[PDB]
Amino acid sequence: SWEVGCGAPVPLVKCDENSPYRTITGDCNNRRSPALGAANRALARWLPAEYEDGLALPFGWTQRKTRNGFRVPLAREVSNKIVGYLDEEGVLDQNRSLLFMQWGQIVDHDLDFAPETELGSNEHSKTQCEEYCIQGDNCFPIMFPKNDPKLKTQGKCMPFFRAGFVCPTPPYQSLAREQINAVTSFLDASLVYGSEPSLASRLRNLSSPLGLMAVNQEAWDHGLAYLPFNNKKPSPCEFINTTARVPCFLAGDFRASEQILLATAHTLLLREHNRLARELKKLNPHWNGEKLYQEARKILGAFIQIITFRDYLPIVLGSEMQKWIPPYQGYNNSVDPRISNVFTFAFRFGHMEVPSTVSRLDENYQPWGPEAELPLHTLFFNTWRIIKDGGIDPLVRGLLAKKSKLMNQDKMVTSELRNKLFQPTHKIHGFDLAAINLQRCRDHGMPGYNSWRGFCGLSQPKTLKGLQTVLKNKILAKKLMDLYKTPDNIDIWIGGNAEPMVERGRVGPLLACLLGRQFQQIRDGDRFWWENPGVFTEKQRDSLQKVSFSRLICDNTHITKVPLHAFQANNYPHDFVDCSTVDKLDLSPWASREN
Numbered sequence: 040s041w042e043v044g045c046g047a048p049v050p051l052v053k054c055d056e057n058s059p060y061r062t063i064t065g066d067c068n069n070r071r072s073p074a075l076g077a078a079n080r081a082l083a084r085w086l087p088a089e090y091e092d093g094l095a096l097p098f099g100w101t102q103r104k105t106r107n108g109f110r111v112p113l114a115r116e117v118s119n120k121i122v123g124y125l126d127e128e129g130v131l132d133q134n135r136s137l138l139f140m141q142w143g144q145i146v147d148h149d150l151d152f153a154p155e156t157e158l159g160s161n162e163h164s165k166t167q168c169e170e171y172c173i174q175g176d177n178c179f180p181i182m183f184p185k186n187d188p189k190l191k192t193q194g195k196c197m198p199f200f201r202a203g204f205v206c207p208t209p210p211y212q213s214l215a216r217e218q219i220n221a222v223t224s225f226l227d228a229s230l231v232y233g234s235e236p237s238l239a240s241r242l243r244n245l246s247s248p249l250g251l252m253a254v255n256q257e258a259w260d261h262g263l264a265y266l267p268f269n270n271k272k273p274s275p276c277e278f279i280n281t282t283a284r285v286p287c288f289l290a291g292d293f294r295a296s297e298q299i300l301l302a303t304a305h306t307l308l309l310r311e312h313n314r315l316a317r318e319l320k321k322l323n324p325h326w327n328g329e330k331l332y333q334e335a336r337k338i339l340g341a342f343i344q345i346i347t348f349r350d351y352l353p354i355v356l357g358s359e360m361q362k363w364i365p366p367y368q369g370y371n372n373s374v375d376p377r378i379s380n381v382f383t384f385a386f387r388f389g390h391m392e393v394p395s396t397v398s399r400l401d402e403n404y405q406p407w408g409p410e411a412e413l414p415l416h417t418l419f420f421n422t423w424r425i426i427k428d429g430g431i432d433p434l435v436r437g438l439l440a441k442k443s444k445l446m447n448q449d450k451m452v453t454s455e456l457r458n459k460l461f462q463p464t465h466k467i468h469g470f471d472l473a474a475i476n477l478q479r480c481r482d483h484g485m486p487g488y489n490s491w492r493g494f495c496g497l498s499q500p501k502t503l504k505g506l507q508t509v510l511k512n513k514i515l516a517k518k519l520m521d522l523y524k525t526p527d528n529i530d531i532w533i534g535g536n537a538e539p540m541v542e543r544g545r546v547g548p549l550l551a552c553l554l555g556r557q558f559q560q561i562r563d564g565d566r567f568w569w570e571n572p573g574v575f576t577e578k579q580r581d582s583l584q585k586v587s588f589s590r591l592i593c594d595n596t597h598i599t600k601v602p603l604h605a606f607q608a609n610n611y612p613h614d615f616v617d618c619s620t621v622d623k624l625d626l627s628p629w630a631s632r633e634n
């Protein structure tokens with residue numbers, strides 16, 4: 040029946056109709072249905088959850104209950120036999136910079152986050168999911184297949200805890216278990232400011248009346264601000280170099296310090312806030328903090344929307360962009376603005392775009408110091424390499440002049456993430472991002488590959504040759520069906536990402552359909568989208584259309600040469616221009632007079 044009710048881990052929020060800015064939580068964006076898009080609600084289902092028992096237990100749970108008549112292959116076996124590779128030569132994308140990979144993680148972290156259940160803290164369950172590898176409740180461990188090298192050096196499993204879900208959190212029964220989205224579904228810069236108002240206030244400098252964002256007081260980057268430290272322990276950023284004991288950064292997203300370039304990108308966005316806030320004050324000295332914060336928070340929001348929709352999505356989706364994301368026709372309040380559960384896996388295409396090294400580049404874009412180049416795995420929850428070894432300018436340079444990994448059917452995920460992922464809670468650089476994603480698809484009751492081909496109106500192959508024709512890869516198709524036995528059983532993550540790339544893009548048909556459809560929804564379903572008439576003056580909107588990631592860098596670093604298109608492959612000095620050449624974001628149209 041109409042179980043439209045279910046939702047009692049939530050207060051619900053009286054909406055002040057006339058309010059001219061967004062909520063932190065995303066409530067009230069939709070007037071008829073205010074909870075839509077808002078953080079700490081269920082991920083939308085584009086298709087019914089598919090669970091071993093049609094309730095919550097994930098496929099592969101019971102050593103006995105098949106899927107369509109076959110055992111599901113161990114997550115890690117799939118990783119080992121399909122996802123892995125050795126030779127990092129020839130893998131880099133000759134036309135996408137590292138910034139391409141980085142903006143994908145930024146946009147993702149803005150849109151969706153299903154955290155693990157935090158019941159299991161104040162409990163041994165953490166430690167003997169770890170050691171004993173005993174599957175129970177929300178401990179869903181990743182078992183190693185026969186002849187797995189980790190069998191020798193790491194024990195029997197890598198640990199894994201199930202995603203948080205709505206209404207209950209420990210107790211029984213489900214209409215069908217729906218995982219939570221802990222951040223606002225609207226592309227709203229929620230990774231900068233927060234999705235809970237608790238954390239949002241905590242990120243603000245309320246001392247000044249300038250509605251500035253809080254900055255580091257311990258340490259500075261040639262005068263330019265850093266994020267404030269998360270001063271609460273344990274800190275996995277302390278754990279990786281105790282000598283340095285430099286904690287993780289505090290941002291509106293929990294994951295800001297997962298890797299050193301995400302915290303770099305976060306730090307550019309913060310400075311952009313305070314830059315905007317204290318520039319408005321010059322222009323409009325009467326405006327209090329609450330109006331400096333919100334009016335700068337409103338511009339950062341739109342910057343992200345422009346860069347995403349004008350520069351990112353076009354070079355991800357390619358041929359397929361215009362079919363899914365045609366010109367803006369205005370707010371449709373009948374559009375579902377929610378992130379879907381499948382999208383949180385479609386957007387994980389990013390993982391095959393991450394290369395095995397990160398470089399630091401001097402003012403002539405040459406190797407900075409004698410360890411200019413570092414293995415990615417040494418940069419998980421690494422904040423000290425920024426604070427005690429050069430700042431962000433050397434790191435932002437690499438972002439511009441180093442390349443993304445090109446996704447590759449026989450070189451899918453670098454060993455840096457497939458074998459040497461660091462998890463915040465555990466103690467080894469020993470985890471497998473790829474096997475994690477596969478385990479997680481099952482945890483979330485993901486429909487198989489063909490259900491989603493069906494969904495997007497593409498062929499549902501049932502044969503080895505049917506699958507050879509789609510993946511355009513005799514060996515990949517052979518390897519997949521040796522594991523899954525039917526294309527119906529192939530986990531959506533590796534299904535989507537196995538397809539060749541659509542033209543002038545970096546995803547195959549299935550993922551372009553899933554991704555395109557969600558960004559279409561994120562735009563059309565937002566009352567506060569920057570092009571939506573009313574939100575901005577005409578004069579503001581012509582002055583916002585000239586933003587660039589190039590611009591953002593020039594204004595928030597001591598870097599002076601930048602490419603005109605920061606996402607394509609740009610070599611120094613040919614493709615780099617001076618900063619007096621880009622186009623500033625002019626805020627003349629933001630002048631409040633008086634009465």
Ligand code: HEM
Pocket residue numbers: 140141142143144147151152153154297298382383384386387388389390392393456472475476479
């Ligand atoms: C380490 C990790 C990265 C880089 C060094 C990285 C990078 C990306 C990019 C570039 C993405 C998109 C273009 C992207 C999307 C999503 N990721 Fe992923 N990522 C790293 C590590 C992780 C880890 C760990 C997770 C959690 C996975 C789990 O189930 O435990 C992770 C997730 C995601 C994700 C899902 C987010 C959510 O809603 O929970 C993406 C959409 N990444 N990453």
Ligand SMILES: [Ca+2]
Pocket residue numbers: 149150222223224225226227228229230
């Ligand atoms: Ca958001």
Ligand SMILES: [Cl-]
Pocket residue numbers: 083084085086379380381382
């Ligand atoms: Cl879904």
